[PDB]
Amino acid sequence: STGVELYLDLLKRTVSNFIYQDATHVAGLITQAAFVEEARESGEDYPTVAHTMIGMKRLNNLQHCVESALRDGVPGDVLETGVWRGGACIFARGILKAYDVRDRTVWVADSFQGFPKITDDDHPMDAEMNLHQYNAAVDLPTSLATVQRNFSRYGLLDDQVRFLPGWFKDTMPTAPFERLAVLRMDGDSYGATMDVLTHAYPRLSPGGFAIIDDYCIPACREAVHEYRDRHGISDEIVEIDRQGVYWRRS
Amino acid sequence: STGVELYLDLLKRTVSNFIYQDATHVAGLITQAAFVEEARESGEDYPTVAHTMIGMKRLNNLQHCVESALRDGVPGDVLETGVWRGGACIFARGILKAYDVRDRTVWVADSFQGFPKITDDDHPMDAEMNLHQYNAAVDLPTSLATVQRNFSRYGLLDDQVRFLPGWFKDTMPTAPFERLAVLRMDGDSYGATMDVLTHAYPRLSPGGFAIIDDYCIPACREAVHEYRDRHGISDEIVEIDRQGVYWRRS
Ligand SMILES: CC[C@H]1OC(=O)C[C@@H](O)[C@H](C)[C@@H](O[C@@H]2O[C@H](C)[C@@H](O[C@H]3C[C@@](C)(O)[C@@H](O)[C@H](C)O3)[C@H](N(C)C)[C@H]2O)[C@@H](CC=O)C[C@@H](C)C(=O)/C=C/C(C)=C/[C@@H]1CO[C@@H]1O[C@H](C)[C@@H](O)[C@@H](O)[C@H]1OC
Ligand SMILES: CC[C@H]1OC(=O)C[C@@H](O)[C@H](C)[C@@H](O[C@@H]2O[C@H](C)[C@@H](O[C@H]3C[C@@](C)(O)[C@@H](O)[C@H](C)O3)[C@H](N(C)C)[C@H]2O)[C@@H](CC=O)C[C@@H](C)C(=O)/C=C/C(C)=C/[C@@H]1CO[C@@H]1O[C@H](C)[C@@H](O)[C@@H](O)[C@H]1OC
Ligand SMILES: Nc1ncnc2c1ncn2[C@@H]1O[C@H](CSCC[C@H](N)C(=O)O)[C@@H](O)[C@H]1O
Ligand SMILES: Nc1ncnc2c1ncn2[C@@H]1O[C@H](CSCC[C@H](N)C(=O)O)[C@@H](O)[C@H]1O
Ligand SMILES: [Mg+2]
Ligand SMILES: [Mg+2]
Numbered sequence: 001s002t003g004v005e006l007y008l009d010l011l012k013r014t015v016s017n018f019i020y021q022d023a024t025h026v027a028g029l030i031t032q033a034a035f036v037e038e039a040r041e042s043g044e045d046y047p048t049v050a051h052t053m054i055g056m057k058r059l060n061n062l063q064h065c066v067e068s069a070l071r072d073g074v075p076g077d078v079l080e081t082g083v084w085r086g087g088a089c090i091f092a093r094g095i096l097k098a099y100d101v102r103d104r105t106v107w108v109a110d111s112f113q114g115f116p117k118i119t120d121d122d123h124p125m126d127a128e129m130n131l132h133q134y135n136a137a138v139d140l141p142t143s144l145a146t147v148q149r150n151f152s153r154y155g156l157l158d159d160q161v162r163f164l165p166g167w168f169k170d171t172m173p174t175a176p177f178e179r180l181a182v183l184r185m186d187g188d189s190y191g192a193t194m195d196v197l198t199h200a201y202p203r204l205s206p207g208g209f210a211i212i213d214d215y216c217i218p219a220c221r222e223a224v225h226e227y228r229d230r231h232g233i234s235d236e237i238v239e240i241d242r243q244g245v246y247w248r249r250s
Numbered sequence: 251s252t253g254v255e256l257y258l259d260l261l262k263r264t265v266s267n268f269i270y271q272d273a274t275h276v277a278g279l280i281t282q283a284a285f286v287e288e289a290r291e292s293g294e295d296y297p298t299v300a301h302t303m304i305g306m307k308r309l310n311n312l313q314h315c316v317e318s319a320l321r322d323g324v325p326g327d328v329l330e331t332g333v334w335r336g337g338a339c340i341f342a343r344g345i346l347k348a349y350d351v352r353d354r355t356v357w358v359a360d361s362f363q364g365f366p367k368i369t370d371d372d373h374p375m376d377a378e379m380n381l382h383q384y385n386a387a388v389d390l391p392t393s394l395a396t397v398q399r400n401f402s403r404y405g406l407l408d409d410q411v412r413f414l415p416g417w418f419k420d421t422m423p424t425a426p427f428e429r430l431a432v433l434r435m436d437g438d439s440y441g442a443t444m445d446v447l448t449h450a451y452p453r454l455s456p457g458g459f460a461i462i463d464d465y466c467i468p469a470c471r472e473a474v475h476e477y478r479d480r481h482g483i484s485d486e487i488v489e490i491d492r493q494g495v496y497w498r499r500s
Binding site for chain 1: 251252253254256260261263267269271272301405
């Protein structure tokens with residue numbers, strides 16, 4: 001193991017808190033608070049303290065995507081839409097740091113208020129799920145200042161981290177990046193997924209990676225297929241774990 | 251910031267839990283549970299969750315001592331006497347791993363049961379302190395299996411970590427190392443300090459480092475001075491923070 005490999009391995013174990021193994025919130029299908037290795041490994045629990053809920057398999061995927069882009073010379077920044085406490089974005093910034101990359105940015109996009117209240121404009125599938133109901137139960141609303149604080153604890157808050165606070169329908173169309181190498185979508189709903197595909201995906205470079213964290217949710221999956229059909233996108237959808245998938249843009 | 255530097259920096263932040271900032275036990279002069287940055291920085295609190303209580307200044311000192319020995323070709327292993335949850339030894343093993351050192355071992359010596367009960371054989375200063383009384387209050391007794399589990403969580407449990415379970419007066423005289431490059435003493439009492447200086451210090455290589463974690467405790471300081479006077483040791487005692495000192499063996 002080289003210094004870089006050790007750092008990034010430890011950074012994954014730290015943002016997902018395999019080190020101290022915090023309890024999960026009891027919500028959804030999780031009936032007990034105890035830390036379960038297999039659940040944290042696959043990002044299936046709702047950590048009480050950890051900085052990311054995506055788990056080790058999806059952290060490994062993010063590493064693969066960012067490293068492949070760097071190795072192949074795919075131009076552009078990294079954007080995560082839906083960041084919670086910031087752990088996955090912290091990890092992304094750590095990857096760039098490990099390779100001393102000075103000319104790419106990690107964009108951190110969130111409401112910083114949890115899921116939005118349902119309105120009449122919402123897709124019927126989104127209305128039925130009403131994700132907003134879960135905000136407090138899994139401690140989702142996390143302020144911009146809290147996320148910035150978290151980056152600082154790792155020594156990774158600097159000007160290669162830029163924040164996009166607001167609802168995606170508002171922030172994405174005019175977000176000030178020109179190109180993306182990795183687009184990581186983690187907003188769960190048809191609405192959030194369609195907002196980001198519509199307004200950010202056209203800036204994803206050829207050879208770049210589009211990661212759909214929540215593909216197991218029917219509303220998210222519906223947005224993905226509607227978008228791909230509309231644009232004639234046939235790039236193979238590759239499964240990461242029981243939740244996430246990705247494709248590589250050609 | 252190279253891979254190695256980033257890894258060791260994160261490792262220090264992780265074993266001391268600057269990342270998630272756990273509460274302290276309320277004991278001694280600490281009257282409130284809150285995490286206080288300045289106290290964790292100087293190793294002055296009693297972490298409820300963190301794997302080491304020595305803090306960042308003493309972790310930095312340990313890094314300096316191990317790196318200097320490696321740089322200067324000082325032969326031998328690393329021994330810590332008094333390891334608690336294992337954080338400082340985990341860090342030591344991480345340093346060797348970062349530099350791909352395959353021919354040195356980290357020895358992890360502890361009762362794995364906390365401070366010993368006082369008897370009439372104890373030095374009067376040890377008897378007056380009666381450190382045993384604090385075992386539960388700071389969660390000091392930590393089993394070998396727990397310490398091994400903690401190493402595993404960082405990916406650092408391998409054949410270059412060897413354990414010496416028992417009281418120092420029993421384990422040190424025949425411990426199966428031949429030479430030390432760094433001897434880190436963290437047992438607080440006159441007795442533990444004198445046991446280890448008596449039985450381990452002769453195996454410290456010239457150019458090696460003797461670290462006294464608890465020099466601020468009068469009983470510990472008494473043993474250090476008695477031992478140095480007896481052996482005619484005059485190497486400068488260099489202060490680290492409000493607790494620890496070290497010297498380099500001529
Ligand atoms: C705590 C927040 C979390 O809530 C949840 O997980 C809530 C879910 O358990 C949800 C309730 C499930 O619905 C219920 O599943 C049960 C297994 C069914 O009951 C059994 C028994 C039975 C007899 O009914 C049988 O017929 C039937 C087949 O199975 C339920 N049946 C009534 C049908 C079914 O209702 C689910 C489908 C399964 O996983 C429904 C579909 C639409 C879905 O996937 C929705 C996801 C949601 C709402 C996720 C949020 C948001 O969490 C996010 O999840 C992502 C995947 C993560 O990556 C994170 O982004 C996370 O964000 C915090
Ligand atoms: C929780 C375990 C911890 O307990 C503790 O810290 C307990 C100590 O606060 C202890 C109580 C202090 O004694 C008390 O000090 C107070 C400051 C005095 O009160 C004031 C007020 C006054 C009016 O008395 C006046 O005279 C004057 C202003 O002092 C107290 N007076 C009553 C005199 C005096 O009692 C202490 C000296 C100062 O720190 C005494 C000397 C001998 C000492 O250093 C003992 C250390 C011990 C026993 C440490 C253990 C073990 O902790 C270890 O500490 C190491 C340094 C760490 O690295 C760890 O290894 C840790 O192990 C877990
Ligand atoms: N329409 C929308 N606009 C902006 N943010 C949204 C949104 N819908 C959901 N969110 C945000 O999406 C996030 C989903 S959870 C994100 C998990 C995170 N990637 C991790 O590493 O753990 C929440 O932080 C929530 O505030
Ligand atoms: N005489 C003795 N023999 C063996 N172990 C002892 C001892 N006296 C104290 N100990 C052990 O010394 C340790 C003191 S605390 C050690 C702190 C540790 N270095 C850290 O990094 O946080 C305890 O684990 C206790 O069990
Ligand atoms: Mg998700
Ligand atoms: Mg000490």
